[PDB]
Nucleic acid binder design. Sequence first.
RNA 1: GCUGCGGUUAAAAAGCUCGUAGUUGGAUCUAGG
RNA 2: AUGUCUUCAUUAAUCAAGAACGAAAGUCAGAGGUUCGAAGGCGAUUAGAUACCGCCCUAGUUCUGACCGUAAACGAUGCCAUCUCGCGAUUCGGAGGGUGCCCUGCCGAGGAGCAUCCGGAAACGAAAGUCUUUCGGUUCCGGGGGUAGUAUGGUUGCAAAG
Lengths: 22, 71, 82, 207, 215, 99, 81, 121, 129
Amino acid sequence: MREKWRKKRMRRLKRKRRAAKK
Amino acid sequence: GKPKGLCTARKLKTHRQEQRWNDKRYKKAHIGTRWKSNPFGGASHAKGIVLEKIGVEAKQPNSAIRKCVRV
Amino acid sequence: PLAVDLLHPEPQREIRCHKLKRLVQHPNSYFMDVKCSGCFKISTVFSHATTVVVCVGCNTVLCQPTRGKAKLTEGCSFRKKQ
Amino acid sequence: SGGAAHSALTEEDVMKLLATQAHLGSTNLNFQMQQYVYKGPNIINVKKTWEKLLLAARAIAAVENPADVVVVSARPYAQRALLKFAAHTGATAIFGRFSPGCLTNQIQKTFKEPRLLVISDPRIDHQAVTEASYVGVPVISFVNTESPLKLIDIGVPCNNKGERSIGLMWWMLAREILILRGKISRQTGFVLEGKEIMPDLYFYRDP
Amino acid sequence: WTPVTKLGRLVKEKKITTLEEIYLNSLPIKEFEIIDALCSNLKDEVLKISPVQKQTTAGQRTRFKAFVAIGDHAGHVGLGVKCSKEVATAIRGAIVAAKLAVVPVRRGYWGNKIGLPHTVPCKVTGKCASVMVRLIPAPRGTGIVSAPVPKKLLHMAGIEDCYTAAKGSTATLGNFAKATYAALQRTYSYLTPDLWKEEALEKSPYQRHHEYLAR
Amino acid sequence: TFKRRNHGRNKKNRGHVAFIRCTNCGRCCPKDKAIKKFVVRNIVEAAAVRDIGDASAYTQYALPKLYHKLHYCIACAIHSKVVRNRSREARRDRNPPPR
Amino acid sequence: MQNDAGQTVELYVPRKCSSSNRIIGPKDHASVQIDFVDVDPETGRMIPGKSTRYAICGAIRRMGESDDAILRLAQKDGLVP
Amino acid sequence: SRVRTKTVKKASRVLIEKYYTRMTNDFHNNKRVCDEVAIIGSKPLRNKIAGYITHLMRRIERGPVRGISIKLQEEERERRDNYMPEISTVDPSQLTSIKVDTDTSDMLKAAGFNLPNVTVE
Amino acid sequence: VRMNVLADALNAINNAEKRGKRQVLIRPASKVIVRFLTVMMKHGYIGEFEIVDDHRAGKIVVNLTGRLNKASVISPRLNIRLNDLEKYTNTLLPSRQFGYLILTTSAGIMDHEEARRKHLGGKILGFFF
RNA sequence: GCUGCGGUUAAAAAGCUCGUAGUUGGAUCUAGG
RNA sequence: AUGUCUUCAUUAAUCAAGAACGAAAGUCAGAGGUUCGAAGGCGAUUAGAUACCGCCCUAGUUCUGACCGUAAACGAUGCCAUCUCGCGAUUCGGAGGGUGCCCUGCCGAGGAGCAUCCGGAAACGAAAGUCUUUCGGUUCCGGGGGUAGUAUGGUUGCAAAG
């Protein structure tokens, strides 16, 4: 539960980047 | 383990070339953007003009202000 | 032991060794003349027979297949062949 | 042994073995003791026992100074046998616990420099075997069918687990050492200064 | 000096006069006076003194470890290590340990067998933890192609010409020296064809000079 | 560092083992890993067997027993002291402790 | 080892195990050298000063084959039938 | 408390070993003999030694005590060791009807033996 | 799948020698194995060996003299010329005084000394010392 | 790192299997005198 | 797997690309909805408590038909062949005896355990051994720590994402 939350954070950031680029 | 057959020269050479790209030195020297990224463009010396002067806080545990100039 | 005669192994060991791991391979099976009380016809039969060997005209079952050596029917004796 | 008929196994000698049950080794067997076993308990080969006993006797006699031969045992049954063997053969005896460092610690006042070491049981006296392995001291040992032969030079197959067989085997070793030394002879028997050395002397007596 | 062992008694009585019989019979040596008496040309050197610390309740307890290499430059070399509270005592104990650990080294020829042996008989590899040292024969005049630490040990052992290949954490002085020591002492354990000839076992010194020992 | 040769379980020749719910905490633990104990006890405590016997309505009545197979997860087992931590050497000892 | 113009300039020739023919190192302390006294068949007394020497290396001794190795060596030399 | 230190224990052991004859079961007697046989620098120490000596004597009377060598006890032990019966229990005279199992199949035959006394069960 | 009977045989010999055994059994035999063992015999690194026939590849039983440090196979069978024979020997053998490098030439199977004397190259087979 | 590295825990065995290209493939033909 | 004096006769091992299967969660459609239960809402505890604890519960958890293709998917150890030790137990089949059970230092095939050469930085490993004495065949992977499995491009997917 330390790097898994980093993965979750990065996934949220990637989702936001996808929404912005779209 | 690595291949050892008498007719595996292609595989050995191709694998070695492929894995050379995972080497920091080889990649640094053959990447292709070295000239564009390096300020001196591959030279040893360069000339410039002064703009301002700054003091940089030396890293811990050293305490001092090193006196550099922006060129 | 360090000194073991591999060339001439002990016969008891050779008998109690796996058929493929002997100095020279040899099957553990054999052919036998089966004699069944009655028609008294000697019939050659394989020890580990997998089919049901039948009398020629005597028309009776001599052996029954199993997982190992064939099981001779009751009342039938057998003698190994050289 | 020796390729001679005068040193062969004698009728009464083999008799004593069956009398004392010195041929019934334990039900566990060692691949290194496959040799001294003829076909519950495992019955050992009396001829091989005799030959190994003679070989051990010759090895011990090779030590011209009897004190240098050291006999070590910790089994309670073997204390009488060890004391009698030491007295008769002029050897040195170690009873009970073997203090670690006898053979490796030169500063110890218990320090000894045996030229030859004899053991009642390798497993019981494992410490002595390990210590001898540091100074290169040859080891003879009374070993049962399941005993380990690691670092054992001459293993005399016998029933060292028994109550009476151990005493009989120690008595036989002393007898052959003295026979081959000249203090006694086969015909006269085990006698010194006119006193009959009887196996029951070595046999274990319960207090 | 009052010997406390049979070997020491024999050496003091001069019934054993060279280290060669001791090595032949594989008799353990437990008194450095034996080596002192049987090798009068030994010279020693302190390879390194390094402090080691043990954490305790009231700080760190510091003891110094000394590595010493002794040799005669004529085929006998030994390596000792001693850790003690003081550098002087550590050095003395390391010298004693090296003396007790002195071991024989076999020399050989690279090509033509003319003159005295100068190099190792064959390629010999020694190891200690991670440091592995391989000694390879070299022709005359080559010198010792090696790092300083193995070079010192080879000089003490008397090898004049030798190539070296060292691998692992060679910065560990102790392990480097011990690997070199193991490689050097492998020389008289490697079985080459010239030692195939069967020899006859002779009486050990204990067997031969037993009269004085008993007396 | 690997603490145990068996990796804290009893799983050999097996891919997946169904789990059990710990008797105390309720946590899911693999059946091989969970510590099991079979407790057979008198239905009445030793201090009241005599009272129940004297109050019995029958000349000779055998008092029944409770049989419970309890599974504990590692945490609750340690907390309840069904098992204890052992030295490095004593960890390899597999014989059940004296009862 | 022979070398030079025919001279031997080895420090010493090491012993070899009587059973496996392996060199016995100067620091092989698990090796042993057993001696058996010679006996004349009839009287059964040791001949003074006469013995047979056997050396067994530490590797074999530790492997536990020293027993059988000594027995086989004695059988070869006739000390045992 | 009342645990005797190694000093007292060693002194008592040495005194018992060297002057067993003078050591009786009486504390006053042990104190007196200690006074003349040992130079002890403290009266409490002397009394502790005497008390432990009496305690040790009480056990010596019951039986041998490890760490203490007593002349008479060792004579008794060596007599028990030297005990030797009139005739061997393994003499062929006594060995008459020994019951042996089938091990005789060849163990006592290929060896070249035909023991009359052995009886195969 | 077995692909180098010689490699397996030399591995078995090496293991037996390290364990100190007096005889070792080599599974499927072959002419190459026989010639390798014959060269080792001529050079005295093994005792006599007996080829057990069983109407198949057969077996060998070799007597070990306890004199072999190592017997190894070089795979694949590289081509060695007379000019680099010296380099290969210096690379593979412990010393110039002993140890042999086995080649397979047209003249047959020999050691590097015989190959040099006859001025022959060929394919490398293995080495022992 | 072909000679010549490493992949349980330090970086590194694909979740597992089938499979084309590639790579590698058991013993056996004239030995002797 | 075992048994086989049955048949073919090299037909084999490993495998870029390619393909099947692939826990749980998750998505789509249709049935079911007991239990438990993300999210949600309350009662507690706390300085706060968007938590641990308790109560009521929605998706889900179940089935059918399709997607995704990821797990500490672990033995953190690729597959095939071979050699090196001891002991006694265990599952399956066989052989020989005795009365389903017992015996055979019985034979193979598994799955382990403790006596273990050698190996390893060590922990430890009958393999992680038979390697500077390197070299049986073959596939994949690593090259100081981060930036970062991120940006960009490509591709698959309904999406999440791979």
